[PDB]
Design a binder for this molecule. Structure first.
Ligand SMILES: COc1cccc(C(=O)N2CCN3C[C@@H](c4ccc(Cl)cc4)CC[C@@H]3C2)c1Br
Length: 289
């Protein structure tokens, strides 16, 4: 029996096998009756699908069937931790899962919800299939890197390093910049399914590839979207949210800025989290009625 990295047999859990023969752990939240729509939840770097329990329960409460998987190299899925052969693997695997759900629920509209790197994955998925998705909810999507981290000098130095020692790691991401809510920082720091090892050079290069690919995809993006962004985000720069609003061709695009908020808006100070849940609820409800 194939087992998760935590030694649990996949036969005990919801799962799928991707095109590379890797098992991905899956999570579902289905309503009691006929769903109004489907929504895939796309998590960020280093985290996993279980972090979306409360948001998913809210969406299921709106009669959507919510589905997710842990991206390769994350959570309870297989793969070396936080590495990927090419960023497109994440997009391909989302499309596999979406195609499987659409075959089981034909005719239902499908939405995407993505945070952080998961938001870049959602943008690239929707840009790969224009007109396929009904809408997207983006929570601090990866559109622009922190400008102090991604200078030309440092990107060229990382490309040189990647050519020699692709597995060399930097220090870990500073978890205190994820959220002003210190209880949520403590929860993040003690979740065994989160990867807090330093970012490997090779994966840093894939995240730079995601940024480059997102920029080229923006003029192909026509899907309706809700974009939520904190003004003090040190991981996905707020300028990227403004760039997405300017360059996406979508006729239905809305931005809400949370002044002073950090990166994980759905796990921020209660005033911010409650607003994020309310805005997503309203936006999805208006587009599923
Ligand atoms: C747990 O890891 C997490 C948690 C939360 C967010 C992220 C993430 O996606 N980022 C935070 C880093 N930044 C690094 C940046 C970069 C790479 C190489 C070089 Cl030379 C310079 C800059 C590319 C974009 C990513 C986005 C991660 Br990674």
């Amino acid at each position: 029996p194939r087992r998760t990295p935590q030694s649990i047999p996949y036969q005990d859990l919801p799962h799928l096998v991707n095109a590379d023969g890797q098992y991905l752990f899956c999570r579902y939240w289905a309503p009691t009756g006929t769903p109004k729509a489907l929504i895939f939840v796309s998590h960020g770097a280093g985290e996993h699908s279980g972090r979306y329990e409360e948001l998913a329960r809210m969406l299921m409460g709106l009669d959507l069937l919510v589905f997710a998987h842990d991206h390769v190299g994350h959570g309870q899925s297989e793969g070396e931790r936080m590495v990927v052969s090419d960023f497109h693997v994440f997009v391909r695997d989302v499309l596999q899962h979406v195609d499987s759900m659409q075959k089981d629920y034909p005719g239902l509209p499908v939405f995407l919800l993505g945070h952080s790197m998961g938001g870049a994955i959602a943008i690239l998925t929707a840009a790969e299939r224009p007109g396929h998705f009904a809408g997207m909810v983006l929570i601090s999507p990866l559109v622009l890197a922190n400008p102090e981290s991604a200078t030309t000098f440092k990107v060229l130095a990382a490309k040189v390093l990647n050519s020699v020692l692709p597995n060399l790691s930097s220090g870990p991401i500073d978890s205190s910049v994820l959220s002003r809510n210190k209880t949520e920082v403590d929860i993040y720091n003690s979740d065994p399914l989160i990867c807090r090892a330093g970012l490997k050079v090779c994966f840093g290069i894939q995240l730079l590839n995601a940024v480059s690919r997102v920029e080229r995809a923006l003029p192909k993006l026509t899907v309706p979207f809700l974009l939520l962004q904190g003004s003090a985000d040190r991981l996905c720069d707020s300028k990227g949210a403004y760039l997405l609003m300017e360059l996406a061709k979508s006729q239905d695009k809305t931005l809400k800025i949370y002044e002073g908020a950090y990166h994980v808006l759905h796990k921020e100070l209660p005033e911010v989290t409650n607003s994020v849940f309310h805005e997503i609820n309203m936006w999805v409800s208006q587009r599923t009625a």
